[PDB]
Amino acid sequence: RTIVVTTILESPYVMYKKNHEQLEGNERYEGYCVDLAYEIAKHVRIKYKLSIVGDGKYGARDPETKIWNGMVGELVYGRADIAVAPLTITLVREEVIDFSKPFMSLGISIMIKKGTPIESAEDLAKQTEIAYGTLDSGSTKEFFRRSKIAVYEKMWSYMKSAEPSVFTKTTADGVARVRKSKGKFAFLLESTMNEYIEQRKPCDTMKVGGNLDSKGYGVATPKGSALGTPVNLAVLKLSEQGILDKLKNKWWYDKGEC
């Protein structure tokens, strides 16, 4: 009767509460997706347990074994019933899982340390003093691997063979590399993550230029699940009632430090 909700530790979507080591079960976590899961379970009327994905990945298919990892893999292999997380809606994932209509709209973006002389992806692609990368194993890395746009092909050619690796294990590792690099590392990541980090101390980073593409996050269910329909309607209801706006303001802007 209790459904397993897979998700990932990614601020401010899911975070440990301050005293989480004294707490158990769902009470360990807080954040936008923890709130979204509660609101959705309320409409769909289900009990659920949040489960942080073991491998800390979003979901990609290994080109050799064809095995899905990450939250996507948890759904595909029947280990979770729903993923409530900043999981980007993408073609290759829509072939194997179902997604709700998007609960947030976003785009890939550039994060720089303040004062870095970069205003656009064209600006990063034409030089080499400033290194740049993305999260390993997610949709941003696939965006660059698959692009046929000249500027993005140029960036992919640079990242794919950069040494030491510019592909990071977590977004937090990318942000910390930006922060420690004295302006010599820029990070390509989703605009929602970029906008959150910009409002957090030490307020030393900023999003530059417009977004590179336009996409969304969706709540994901196994292909054919009976949860898919009521979840989708739940998301649309929450959107129309202004709850999603309210949550984004709560988690991004109401605490802003910058």
Ligand X SMILES: N[C@@H](Cn1oc(=O)[nH]c1=O)C(=O)O
Binding residues for L-glutamate: 86, 88, 93, 139-140, 190
Q: Is 58 a residue that touches ligand X (CB under 6 A)?
A: yes
Here's the x/- map for ligand X, 181-210, by CB under 6 A: it reads as: --------xx--x-----------------
Per rule CB under 6 A, is residue 244 in the interface with ligand X? no
Report if residue 224 touches a second copy, rule: CB under 8 A: no
Residue 193's binding partner out of ligand X, a second copy, none, with CB under 5 to 8 Å set by partner kind: ligand X
Query: How far apart are CB 191 and a second copy at their closest, in Å?
Result: 12
Give the footprint of ligand X on residues 83-102 (CB under 6 A).
Answer: 86-88
| 147 and 153 Cβ atoms separated by less than 8 Å | yes
The answer to whether the CB of 109 falls within 8 A of the CB of 157 is no
Separation in Å, CA 123 to CA 21, 103, 242:
45, 32, 38
Q: Which helix (H) or strand (E) holds 122?
A: helix 121-125
Give the relative orientation of helices 150-161 and 139-146 as an angle to the nearest 10 degrees: 120
245 contacts a second copy (rule: CB under 8 A): yes
Distances (CA, A) of 62 to 53, 66, 67, 242: 17, 5, 5, 39
249 binds, among ligand X, a second copy, none (CB under 5 to 8 A by kind): none
CB atoms under 10 Å from CB of 119, counted, come to: 12
Distance in angstroms (rounded) separating the CA atoms of residues 239 and 13: 17
Nearer to a second copy, 15 or 110 (CB): 110
Binding residues: 86, 88, 93, 139-140, 190
Half-sphere exposure of 107 (CA within 13 A, CB side): 10
Nearest to a second copy of 15, 222 (CB atom): 222
The listed partner (a second copy, ligand X, none) that binds 205, CB under 5 to 8 Å by sort, is none
Pair of tokens at residue 30 = 């807080």
Residue type, 177: R
State the nearest-atom distance from the C-beta of 233 to ligand X, in Å. 18
Q: Which helix (H) or strand (E) covers residue 198, if one does?
A: none
Residue ranges in 139-158 that form contacts with a second copy under rule CB under 8 A: 143, 146-149
Please give the Cα distance from 186 to 237 (Å, whole number): 38
Contact letters (x/-) for a second copy, 174-213, by CB under 8 A?
Answer: ---------------------------------------x
Both tokens assigned to 235 = 């998301």
CB distance 224 to 98 below 8 Å: yes
- Letters for 74-113 (x = contact with a second copy by CB under 8 A, - = none) are ---------------xxx--xx---x-xx-xx--------
Rounded to whole angstroms, the Cα distance separating 7 from 85 reads: 5
Binding site for a second copy (CB under 8 A): 89-91, 94-95, 99, 101-102, 104-105, 143, 146-149, 213-216, 218, 232-233, 236-237, 239-242, 244-245
Binding site for ligand X (CB under 6 A): 58, 86-88, 135, 138-141, 171, 189-190, 193
